[PDB]
Design a protein around this ligand. Sequence first.
Ligand SMILES: CC(=O)N[C@@H]1[C@@H](O)[C@H](O[C@@H]2O[C@H](CO)[C@@H](O[C@@H]3O[C@H](CO)[C@@H](O[C@@H]4O[C@H](CO)[C@@H](O[C@@H]5O[C@H](CO)[C@@H](O[C@@H]6O[C@H](CO)[C@@H](O)[C@H](O)[C@H]6NC(C)=O)[C@H](O)[C@H]5NC(C)=O)[C@H](O)[C@H]4NC(C)=O)[C@H](O)[C@H]3NC(C)=O)[C@H](O)[C@H]2NC(C)=O)[C@@H](CO)O[C@H]1O
Length: 540
Amino acid sequence: AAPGKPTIAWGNTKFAIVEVDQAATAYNNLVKVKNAADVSVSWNLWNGDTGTTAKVLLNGKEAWSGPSTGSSGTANFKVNKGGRYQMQVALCNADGCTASDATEIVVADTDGSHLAPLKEPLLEKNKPYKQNSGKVVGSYFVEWGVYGRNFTVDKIPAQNLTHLLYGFIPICGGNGINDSLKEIEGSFQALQRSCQGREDFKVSIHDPFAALQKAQKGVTAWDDPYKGNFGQLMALKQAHPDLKILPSIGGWTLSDPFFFMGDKVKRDRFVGSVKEFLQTWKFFDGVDIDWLFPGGKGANPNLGSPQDGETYVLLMKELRAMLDQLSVETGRKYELTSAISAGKDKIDKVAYNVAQNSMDHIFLMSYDFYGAFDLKNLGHQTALNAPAWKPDTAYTTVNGVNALLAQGVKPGKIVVGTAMYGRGWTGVNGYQNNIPFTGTATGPVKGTWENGIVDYRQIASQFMSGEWQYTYDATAEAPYVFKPSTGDLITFDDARSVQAKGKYVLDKQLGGLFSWEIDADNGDILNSMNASLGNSAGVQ
Ligand SMILES: CC(=O)N[C@@H]1[C@@H](O)[C@H](O[C@@H]2O[C@H](CO)[C@@H](O[C@@H]3O[C@H](CO)[C@@H](O[C@@H]4O[C@H](CO)[C@@H](O[C@@H]5O[C@H](CO)[C@@H](O[C@@H]6O[C@H](CO)[C@@H](O)[C@H](O)[C@H]6NC(C)=O)[C@H](O)[C@H]5NC(C)=O)[C@H](O)[C@H]4NC(C)=O)[C@H](O)[C@H]3NC(C)=O)[C@H](O)[C@H]2NC(C)=O)[C@@H](CO)O[C@H]1O
């Protein structure tokens, strides 16, 4: 007769192919990639013949076998593929095999293969849209938004996007390399902590806690291997296989390191670390380069040179070569994109007509044209065209696009930007013909989280009544609110201005639309981005 039926003994059932130290602060101690997870299982047989051979089955497939020597045993084996498995211990002899009831074991991997899909209902004013326009619909999610702004990955209306960008991935470096970070409390210090023992100019993760250790919906167990933003993004991929999730390197406060990459030694080290990063965090689909900006004029007044244009083109070609090599290794397809200035004076410092050959998309930052950074020359911060009171306005969306086209950039590579926040001034005065933009201000408007900036969500619920005047400039395609008594002026993007941008994109055959930043919208902006680009309503 066949052996008796054994039972599985108490013991941990959660393992991982890629290990993460949930208490680490340094990137070099934070993660360790292995070829497989080391799984262990023990069993007991209280009644019956114990057989002659013991086997471990995973979803019915043999993963281990050995001599059965008694009423109890232990098996140690490797599992090289992530997932949730139905594991059983079977005892066999010449007369047959007898399998125990199944115990679920989890083998985690960074592609999110061990996680149930993170499929959350749409919140606030977000409405469902099908991505059938064939146009890009992207938005940036910020790593630090899980704190003060209290916006997590589960709150992203993911079904309404084709591209989700993660801002921002930093480049290691101390004094003289990341000085721009010193303007934000503890930001410079956090990066040094993360880069402890790591070579300068290699990429890293700015806030390991927010990225991998903070408990969040779907990855809330005290012993889950991947938590925080990355853990949720992994689960999000399971729910949306076609969504492109990209890591964005740089941004306003993390661009200083790019200025040193004219040195091939540093550039090679950088490109190399990006490859290893992508091999480590499998849920990412490529890389987005946000160098602000080649030639200078960024956050650091002491950086920028005429050599930057060449370095940029060299960098993109080198990254594309690295991604091709990675593709032959994994068989996957990777995207290479970049967010750039929309000002003509900056665009011409780079030969995008050449760089475009190794890029999938160009995220034209058609916003921040005006703002509290200049209290004398006011104007629409993200308008499509120039206003009637100054047809020669230099900074507009159309001017940015024309500059690229004039170089030879293919229209299909250009993705137009929308703003999910407004910029404002206070004490505006000395204006003519009831056009506030013609005067001057005395400071920044009180912001939602920081001076001179207001979330669209707050504009819609707080500044659309009372003494606030509302006006939609149909010439420039830009709305704005103004409070005469205090001189508060706010320029932003609304459902209508975004609609104009989308129609413009379809008319000129551009790539689509993207926005900054997802947490600031209440649903109106993204709904319009989708609708204006031709996507049809209804869940898919
Ligand atoms: C046409 C022309 O040439 N015009 C010029 C114009 O372009 C220039 O303005 C600059 O434009 C560029 C684009 O060209 C802007 O950069 C891009 O656009 C977005 C939106 O502006 C940028 O977003 C900012 O990103 C920074 C980081 O890079 C954000 O900084 C964060 O600040 C928050 C505080 O609110 C920090 O949060 C704290 O975090 C800690 C944890 O670290 C947490 O514990 C706290 O709770 C939390 N506190 C709060 C309050 O929540 C956070 O740490 C920090 N993050 C980092 C990494 O530093 C900043 O908030 C973003 N601002 C807005 C608005 O959202 C983005 O960098 C970039 N996008 C991309 C994809 O590259 C640039 O911002 C803009 N500069 C300025 C000064 O506005 C102007 C000026 O030079 O000149 C014209 O001529």
